[PDB]
Every structure is written in C-alpha cells, then in structure tokens.
C-alpha cells in the first residue's frame, strides 16, 4: 500500500502546545489525500497553491505536517499575512505559502471543567518569528526598564501563558486542533506522490 501515515498526525491522541509545535516529516509513500478532503470532521480546510483533489496527481520531495492546539479565535492567524500573538510569537507562515491548513474543534478532548492549564502559548517576545521558526525558550521577559536577572516579578513576565480551556467557553475560546501541511519541492527526487 505504501500509505503515507497521515492517520498518526491527524488522529494523534494529544497535540502539542503551539509554542512547542510538532513537525512530522512525511516521505517515501503514497498519500491518500481523499481521506482528508472527504472528512466531514474539519471545520477549516484552506489550501494555498494546491488543491486537495489535485494533489492525488502530484509528487513532492517531502511533506511536512505541523500540529498544535490554539483557541478558536486564533485559527485565522494560521494563514499567510496574519498578525496576532500566534502568528507573531508562536507559528508563522510565509507570505508565499504553498500548503493546506486544517483545523477542528477539540473541546470534547482538550477542555476540562475548572480549566485545562496544560496547553500554553507564547504571549511575550522581543521580535516576531520568521516563517516556520520554533521558540521553546523560557527566559523571563523584561517589560520595563529595570532588568530582571531571570526571576519573574513586576514587569518581568514568564513568557508563556496557559489557555485554561473550559468546555463552557464560547467557541472563540475553545481549543482547536490544527494541522498545517507544507509541500517541499527541492532539487532531489520527489518521494511523496498522490495516487
């Protein structure tokens, strides 16, 4: 069958926090894109420069699947040309992105009464990420003129914030699982093909 392992990305038991977003490299396989675009589960499925149907007749050097959790009102930030805490400080797509962004509501799994504080995002950073950059550092953010010597305190912020997802949140504040598929064509044989 040589079937590309999209099942292990999309049906993974848990997804990463967005500041520590996961990347899976997909290679040397036949990619059944029909199970994706025919899925009735996704609330977001937006492609840039390809179409899921006319991926079944294309080959790429590699395919990257990046996955993470954010809240619903941030899903729009997973798009080229966006601003916001997620696009600026957590996960950044390039202006000329080729790929697909897929997302679905995971309130049933990832929220808890009283709050699930296990999902985090970077709220403070000195500059914006470059496209496809990952920052997992936890240095104290100096927000004022007094230096902080890395402690946490007034004007000296821990850079990551918990989402605290609750199932009664409005949908804008419920958790969404996101997968981003990037399609890489290099001067190298192309090993990921549709059927």
């Amino acid at each position, epitope marked *: 069958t040589n079937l590309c392992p999209f099942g292990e990305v999309f049906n*993974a*038991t*848990r*997804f*990463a*926090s967005v500041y*520590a977003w996961n990347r899976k490299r997909i290679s040397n396989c036949v990619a059944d894109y029909s199970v994706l675009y025919n899925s009735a589960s996704f609330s977001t499925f937006k492609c840039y420069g390809v179409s899921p149907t006319k991926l079944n007749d294309l080959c790429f050097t590699n395919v990257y699947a990046d996955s993470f959790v954010i809240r619903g009102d941030e899903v729009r930030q997973i798009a080229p040309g966006q601003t916001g805490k997620i696009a600026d400080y957590n996960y950044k797509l390039p202006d000329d992105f080729t790929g697909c962004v897929i997302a679905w509501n995971s309130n*049933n*799994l990832d929220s*808890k*009464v*009283g*709050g*699930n*504080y*296990n*999902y*985090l995002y970077r709220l403070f950073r000195k500059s914006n990420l470059k496209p496809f950059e990952r920052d997992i550092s*936890t240095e104290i953010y100096q927000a004022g003129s007094t230096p902080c010597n890395g402690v946490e305190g007034f004007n000296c912020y*821990f850079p*990551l914030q*918990s989402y605290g997802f609750q199932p009664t949140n409005g949908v804008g504040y419920q958790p969404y699982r996101v997968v981003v598929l990037s399609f890489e064509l290099l001067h190298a044989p192309a090993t990921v093909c549709g059927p």
Partner: antibody, heavy 123, light 108 residues
C-alpha cells in the same frame, strides 16, 4: 499515541536506593505536572508526590511519609521524570505509577497513567 | 490532611442493575472529588472529576453527585465489563488522598 514508559521495577535492598524513570512521548512533556502514585498489594492508591510544569519550573510537593527520603525530578530535554528513593523500607514494596495531571493545577486528578512497575524491597 | 472513606466494601449486582457507591471526606472539599475505575492488572482509569463531570470517552451510564463531604457514584445499566474496584480521590489540595475502594462484582 500518548505513552508513559516506566523503568526501575524489580528487587531493591532495604537500605539501598532506587530510581524509577518515566519516559514520555506523544505530547508537550514540559507543560504537564508529573505525579508518582503507588499501590501496595491489596490496598488503594497513594499519591507520592509531583513536580509542576514549566510555569513553576521544578517545584515539587510530597506526601508527608516520603518527604526527605524520595526526590522527584524531571529532565524536559529528555522527556523524563524520575523518583529517586533513598530510604527504602520493606513497607515501600508496591506498584509505582507515573501519571499526568489532568488539569495542570494543584487541585488535580490523573487521566493518563503509566503501566505501573512492581518494586519489591527485600534483603 | 484529608481522610477519605468509602462504602460498601464490596457489592454484587446483575447485568442491567443500577449500583450506588459512596465516598466521604473528613473535611469540606466543595466539589473537588474524582472517581476512578481499576480493572485487574491495570492502572486506575479516571471516570468523573469535580464530583459530576465525565472524563472524555466515559459512558454516560456513569454519574456522580455530591458536594461538601459526602459523594455518590451511580452506575446505571451495569455491564460485565464494569467489574472493577472503584476509588474516590479528593482533588482539592496537594497531598491528594484516595478512599479504600469498593469492589463491584457481577452476578450471573
């Protein structure tokens, strides 16, 4: 899948010492509180301690009956948590579990457990 | 340091029955009470938290009630697969403490 793979079960001598290790995969390990819970033959679970996540880096809490003798630690770069047991009385014989806090708070219950390893304390 | 007790020690019931088990805390824990199910050879499985909230994927035949010191787990439509020991756990504060368990046996 979410996996917590435990090591360290088997025979250990009273007055010896023993480290149990919990190797995680499938999620952002550093963002979770890790608990150790044990269960002696025929009895209910007993929480041993935990170590909080990156927002309170490295901070720990213990059951009174193991404080001082057991040390919980974690290495987020390797995605492991450990229980260093330096007392080791025969009473410590039990199945030991590592487990994730469901909410990531100090008001917590455990929704993901490792399989448990039996530690037998005996000369 | 909060002591948890449970009742009954054990019980037998037939498939399809409704079973009720109780848990008490030695001091007020508001509704910070969880329930676990433990099958042979296995780690406990979290069923209910904050006294009445189901964990994901847990069938609705499990329900919990109570607030303060006294709590109740109800299993309706008892199934053969529900053979297990059930434990309560207060989750209001740090030394998280567990009751002694109730064994549920299946009559057939």
């Amino acid at each position: 899948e979410v996996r917590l793979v435990e090591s360290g079960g088997g025979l250990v001598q009273p007055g010896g010492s023993l480290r149990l290790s919990c190797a995680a995969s499938g999620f952002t390990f550093s963002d979770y509180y890790i608990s150790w819970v044990r269960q002696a033959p025929g009895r209910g679970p007993e929480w041993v301690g935990f170590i909080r996540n990156v927002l309170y880096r490295g901070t720990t809490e213990y059951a009174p009956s193991v404080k001082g003798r057991f040390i919980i630690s974690r290495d987020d770069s390797r995605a492991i948590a450990s229980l260093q047991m330096n007392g080791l009385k025969a009473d410590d014989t039990a199945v030991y579990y590592c487990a994730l806090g469901a909410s990531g708070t100090d008001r917590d219950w455990f929704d993901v457990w490792g399989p448990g390893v039996l530690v037998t304390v005996s000369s | 340091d909060i002591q948890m007790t449970q009742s009954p020690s054990s019980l037998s019931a037939s498939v399809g029955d409704t079973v009720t088990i109780t848990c008490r805390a030695s001091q007020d824990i508001s509704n910070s009470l969880a329930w676990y199910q433990q099958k042979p050879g296995k780690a406990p499985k979290a069923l209910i938290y904050y006294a009445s909230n189901l964990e994901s994927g847990v069938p609705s035949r499990f329900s919990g009630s109570g607030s303060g010191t006294d709590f109740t787990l109800t299993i309706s439509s008892l199934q053969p697969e529900d053979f297990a020991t059930y434990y309560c756990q207060q989750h209001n504060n740090y030394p998280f403490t567990f009751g002694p368990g109730t064994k549920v046996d299946i009559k057939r």
